[PDB]
From Swiss-Prot, chains A, D, E:
Alphabetical list of InterPro entries matching this protein: Gram-neg_bact_OMP, Gram_neg_porin_domain, Porin_dom_sf, Porin_gammaproteobac, Porin_Gram-ve, Porin_Gram-ve_CS
One GO cellular component, as annotated: pore complex
One record GO biological process: monoatomic ion transmembrane transport
Name of the featured protein: Outer membrane porin F
Localization per record: Cell outer membrane
SUPFAM superfamilies hit by this protein: Porins
Domain notes: Each subunit of the trimer has a water-filled pore with a narrow, elliptically shaped (7 X 11 Angstroms) selectivity filter which has a solvent accessible area of 30-40 Angstroms(2).
Membrane-traversing stretches: 1-6, 8-23, 39-51, 54-66, 83-91, 94-100, 135-141, 150-159, 172-182, 184-195, 211-222, 224-235, 253-265, 268-281, 292-303, 306-315, 331-340
Species annotation: Escherichia coli (strain K12)
Curated annotation (Swiss-Prot), chain B:
Residue numbers of the full-length protein present here: 3 to 66 of 582
General function of this protein: This plasmid-coded bactericidal protein is an endonuclease active on both single- and double-stranded DNA but with undefined specificity. Colicins are polypeptide toxins produced by and active against E.coli and closely related bacteria.
Similarity comment: Belongs to the colicin/pyosin nuclease family.
Compositionally biased residues, Gly residues: 18-33, 44-64
Gene: col
Comp. bias intervals (Low complexity): 34-43
Segments of this protein annotated with the region Disordered: 1-64
Protein name, UniProt field: Colicin-E9
Transmembrane domains' residue ranges: none
Length: 340, 64, 394, 340, 340
């Protein structure tokens, strides 16, 4: 909600609370998503200020707090800051921002990540360009300087991050994305490339330096309908863990396919269906294997903008014999949401 | 200590909201002259979405 | 200022204060100044009881007295006499008496008001007329109401409720219908609703905006604005046939038509010259002529019933106010001094203007006399009030 | 304070800061409460929205951040999320909520928990029904569907929580509570029962599976006076720690008695008195012993709703020879509070 | 921004976001400041309420959240609460507060701490009186009871804090500070003394019990100009770490010199220059050595109050052969800020 809109400056505090639960057979080790109560509340602030008619500056930050944790030493587990960045929007030339934000490839992967709770599994966090990361500088053009309506492009530089874990570390990277929206229809294409750090190469799995991601997305949203299809391929970019070996690293090659079909009703209802798949190739000692392969069937009732309820049933098609100890169990989630 | 102060039992609510509507509370007028400001102007709004998009999409990449 | 006059409490607590209504009516016109009740030299209950010298001493040459009596059937008799206290002292210049039910006591008062005013001005009285307007209540399901009331804010009633915008009502010359914009269908439409039975006639539902209806004074035509061409332009419908002709064609915005008395020419607001100005055009031969050259902005015009002047919303040096423009000289007189002055409408005798302002944060309409001498707030409503329109003679 | 009350939605950001200190003889190991600086600030948001005339939805969340901690590795010590839930209020049938909230038994134990700083020790957190926990589903009725004024009842189901520690873990549970307020007088009765997990049984102390709590409360509050008396009994539910053995577990049986008497004055003053006692029985190797036995003598000056100061002197009657290493020392605390 | 100003109560939520980066040759081990992405967001709330005409109460709290961290185990690293205190301001006699706040000596050290990112290195945190610490009770007088304009004084008591590390611990302490501002010029003098805990004495470096800090500051600020010069001396108060020995402790004696000269322009520009030096004496086994010795050269563009950008180049004059493993490398930092 907009709490402060004065002096040519406007502040929008946006926050929500989600009472959530996951069900599944067994304790939930093998469940796709998990099991139990997954309630969490997010708080964030967005701020703008028009310095000049043609130049305005903005800053946004978001944090997520989990409620499933106890009040002991594990209170902070799963608590983090998702987004924290700033930037300025010029009138037509474009806009430039910096901070902790989504990677260009997320722009392409946004079409599939429309599910209530699950979805966007391929778009891992703290990954090169697919998810939200810290240390990015992004430039964006809307409608190509107002030349061509609906066609906008963005470019992003990624400062190297040498962290303790290869899963969370990266190096110098670059990426770009283009999106043409016309009359409701939408097309997008994004590409990102970066260098893997010594820790990443040193990992038992994974080989090579050039970590590459790219994706193409298509969609149509109108008439209370939303269809979407994103196909993305990556090299040495996706993280992978082997429970049998209890060893991690990156995937020499990965193909990911996402498909979504959601309908919406006037009476605050939106049933959803989603197919997903990700196959890794040239895995060290496991050849080619499927990381995730499932169906979605879910729904969301929108009492209003500030109140909603939803359910999602994930038909995990992964088999138990999978060569990475992956969870071969179905799962379901039921959630209730308040948001201001 | 001091937790008891206030802390109503039973259901929880404080006072009347400013407006009736769950999602449509404002002042008035519809049919618009396109002027953006007159008495026959509907929106009565500005600085619509001056700020840039901030990760449009659900954003629940993996799961809590 | 205004002509001083004595208005005496009526002979009877009384079910309604008729003398106070007469004083308020005479005062609202700007043309009269009823003597403060606390300074009356006497309270005669009859013409015989009038002492002319005591009123002439105070500069009053006429005195209104009257009587309210209960009838055995529960109705009431209301009578008034106007007694000369000037050149023919004690002579009765006019008088009347009539029977009304309690709910028509104000009308009885309004009846008296109409005749004395005319006697003293030669002008037909307009105190029995009505105003139409749109009220936004705090109800959820039907936030928009088209309502009508007496000019002074009493006797309000609801004419239609709608979940969507209504604007800019306009009376048929017979007082039986209201035109208005409705979005009940999901987009804009122009409709004419008959008040007596609530029947709604659909007039127009063209692409984009359908707005600003106006009935011709002779009752044969409806003017209104369509923006189908890309910008707002004026159109007229022959109500008998339903046929629509185009009057203006251009890239500019053209809306808020008002009829001249001849039922052949419209005044309207145009941005053809940049900032809004008022133009006049024949509904047949179309070529608009600018008629406003004073100030910096003029808009939302309503032409007087004699066509000799108009009222409008004028901006001169930052200040927007209700102004009056003489059409044969260009002389402009500012009438209103409130804020956010909008949507003026003239009484059928041209003597009073009703309009919307910042008063009550939108919830109050205001009256101003066209001589500039009197200004008042109407009784507050339970909502936001817009688009007032003063009825014809009733 | 209410910052946004628009669009049939209202947000009340409520947060406070407390400059606090605890004094006691010695270092404070044996002191009832402790010793030193205990300053802390809590932030939270409550939100409502009337979806329909007869149906409204609400969400509430609270977090506590401690300021006494340093800026080193211990910065996050004592930082947690207290409450995070949502729910809907129907016109008359009642209201149903879910998330992280107080347990029904807390409703009964609220009467005694009126002290300025100390108090409600029995109402431990992350305990079965006495304190605030995550994973509860509660239904509440007000005035018994509007039938009888002042008499309201609630029912609560408790999803199992498998955590690392028995102190913070639980299992499937159920509970109920009823409260009748008439002419100032108030009566309440609450009961909760649940099953202990295998991890809980593994504790050296404690025996059995059915962990049971129940409590009865009486009060009179009016005319600037507040009297309260809560008597509660539990089996295999209350936590206990032995410093001599450095071993913990639960109490086979426990009785708890709490009594409070507070007066308030027009000139922002509120002297308070509280008696307390808790005796555990059938302890493994310790027979029956008293966990807490003390008097309170304290006061609170209320400058206004948003500003207050207070003091509390705890006369600990516990003896040093107590068979659980319990702190047998008195204590005092002095606090100042700002709250919006 | 002021979000709630009603009922004689006012609340000002103040928060900002900073996209920051540090550059330097190499990985940044030897760099003065460091290297990489230092984006961070701070949130805080201030609140006042006029209880009486002559008495008002205030509460202030601030927290800092780091964005440089990942979403893994290191999310909370560097996240803390900077300020959290309360207090009351009487009309003329003065004002008294308590909580976690800056030490009196910081009052003197404020003149030098005007730099965009670096600066105020001597005013370390969790140190006795130079930086912000927890457990302080401060009283302040403004204009000497309104007798003499521009001359104000403060006194502060510091409750002992027994923490895990000598770096964050202290003991009973007292201090005072006086500041006379006349015609734009400003003068300040602060002194603080406290007792070191056993852990502090047990440290290999440092000797004596009376940990003492004091400082003197002079300045002239006007006409978009700000000159400042703070000279401070301390005994057994400043922290020191030896990479060669990998051992820490305190400095038996230290002299610190800080000089700042900043100009401001009408068109949102503010160039800055700063000299700094710190020499420790009577080091155990290292005699006298320089901890920090550098120049600053930087600038700041102020788009408006809510938006700004800045740069700072630190010419570290410390040599590599320093006998404490100090960074003998230059450094630079570039930052952008949004703040409400």
């Amino acid at each position: 909600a907009e709490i402060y809109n004065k002096d040519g400056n406007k502040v929008d505090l946006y926050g929500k609370a989600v009472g959530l639960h996951y069900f599944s057979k067994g304790n939930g080790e093998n469940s796709y998503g998990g099991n139990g109560d997954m309630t969490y509340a997010r708080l964030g602030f967005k701020g703008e200020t028009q310095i000049n008619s043609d130049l305005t500056g903005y800053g946004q930050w978001e944090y997520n707090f989990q409620g499933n944790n106890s009040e002991g030493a594990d209170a902070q587990t799963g608590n983090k800051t998702r987004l924290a960045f700033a930037g300025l929007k010029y009138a037509d030339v474009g806009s430039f921002d910096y901070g902790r934000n989504y990677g260009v490839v997320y722009d392409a992967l946004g079409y599939t990540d429309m599910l209530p709770e699950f979805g966007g599994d391929t778009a891992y966090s703290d990954d090169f360009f697919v998810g939200r990361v810290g240390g990015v500088a992004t430039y964006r053009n809307s409608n190509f300087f107002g030349l061509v309506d609906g066609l906008n492009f963005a470019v992003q530089y990624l400062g190297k991050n040498e962290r303790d874990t290869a899963r969370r570390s990266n190096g110098d990277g670059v990426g770009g994305s283009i999106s043409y929206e016309y009359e409701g229809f939408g097309i997008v294409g994004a590409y990102g490339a970066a260098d893997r750090t010594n820790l990443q190469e040193a990992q038992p799995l994974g080989n090579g330096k050039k970590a590459e991601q790219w994706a193409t997305g298509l969609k149509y949203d109108a008439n209370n309908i939303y269809l979407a299809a994103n196909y993305g391929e990556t090299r040495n970019a996706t993280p992978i863990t082997n429970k049998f070996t209890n060893t991690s690293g990156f995937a020499n090659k990965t193909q990911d396919v996402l498909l979504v079909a959601q309908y919406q009703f006037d009476f605050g209802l939106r049933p959803s269906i989603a197919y997903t798949k990700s196959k890794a190739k040239d895995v060290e000692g496991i050849g080619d294997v499927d990381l995730v392969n499932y169906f979605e069937v879910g729904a969301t009732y929108y009492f209003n903008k500030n109140m909603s309820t939803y359910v999602d049933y994930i038909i995990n098609q992964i088999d138990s014999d999978n060569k990475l100890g992956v969870g071969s169990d179905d799962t379901v989630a039921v959630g209730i949401v308040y948001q201001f | 200590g001091g937790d008891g102060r206030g802390h109503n039992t039973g259901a929880h609510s404080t006072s009347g909201n400013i407006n009736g509507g769950p999602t449509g509370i404002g002042v008035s007028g519809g049919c618009s002259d396109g002027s953006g400001w007159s008495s026959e102007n509907n929106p009565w709004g500005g600085g619509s979405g001056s700020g840039i998009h901030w990760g449009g999409g659900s954003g629940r990449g993996n799961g809590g | 200022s205004g002509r001083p006059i004595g208005v005496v409490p009526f002979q009877w607590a009384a079910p309604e204060d008729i003398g106070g209504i007469v004083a308020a009516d005479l005062r609202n016109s700007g043309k009269f100044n009823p003597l403060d009740r606390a300074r009356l030299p006497q309270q005669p209950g009859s013409a015989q009881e009038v002492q002319p010298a005591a009123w002439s001493a105070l500069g009053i040459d006429a005195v209104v007295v009257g009587q309210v009596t209960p009838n055995p059937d529960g109705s009431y008799n209301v009578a008034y006499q106007l007694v000369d206290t000037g050149g023919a002292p004690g002579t009765v210049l006019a008088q009347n008496s009539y029977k009304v039910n309690k709910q028509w006591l104000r009308y009885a008062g309004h009846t008296a008001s109409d005749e004395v005013f005319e006697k003293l001005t030669g002008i037909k009285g307009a105190f029995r007329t009505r105003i139409a307007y749109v009220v936004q209540t705090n109800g959820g399901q039907f936030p928009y109401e088209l309502r009508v009331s007496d000019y002074d804010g009493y006797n309000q009633f609801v004419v239609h409720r709608s979940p969507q915008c209504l604007m800019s009502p306009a009376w048929s010359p017979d007082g039986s219908k209201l035109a208005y914009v409705t979005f009940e269908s999901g987009r804009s439409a122009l409709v004419i609703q008959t008040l007596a039975n609530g029947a709604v006639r659909q007039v127009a539902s063209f692409p984009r905006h359908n707005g600003a209806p106006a009935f011709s004074p002779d009752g044969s035509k409806l003017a209104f604005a369509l923006s189908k061409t890309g910008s707002l332009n004026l159109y007229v419908m022959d109500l008998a046939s339903g046929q629509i002709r185009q009057v203006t064609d251009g890239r500019s915005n053209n809306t808020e038509p008002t009829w001249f008395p001849d039922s052949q020419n419209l005044a309207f607001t145009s941005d053809q010259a940049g900032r809004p100005q008022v133009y006049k055009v024949n509904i047949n031969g179309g070529a608009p002529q600018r008629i406003t050259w004073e100030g910096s902005q003029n808009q939302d015009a309503d032409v007087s019933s004699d066509g000799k002047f108009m009222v409008m919303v004028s901006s001169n040096g930052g200040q927007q106010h209700i102004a009056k423009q003489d059409l044969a000289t260009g002389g402009v007189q500012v009438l209103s001094s409130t804020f956010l002055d909008e949507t003026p409408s003239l009484a059928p005798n041209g003597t009073m203007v009703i309009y919307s302002s910042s008063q009550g944060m939108g919830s109050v309409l205001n009256l101003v006399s066209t001589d500039g001498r009197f200004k008042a707030r109407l009784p507050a409503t339970d909502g936001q009030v817009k688009f007032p329109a003063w009825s014809p003679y009733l």
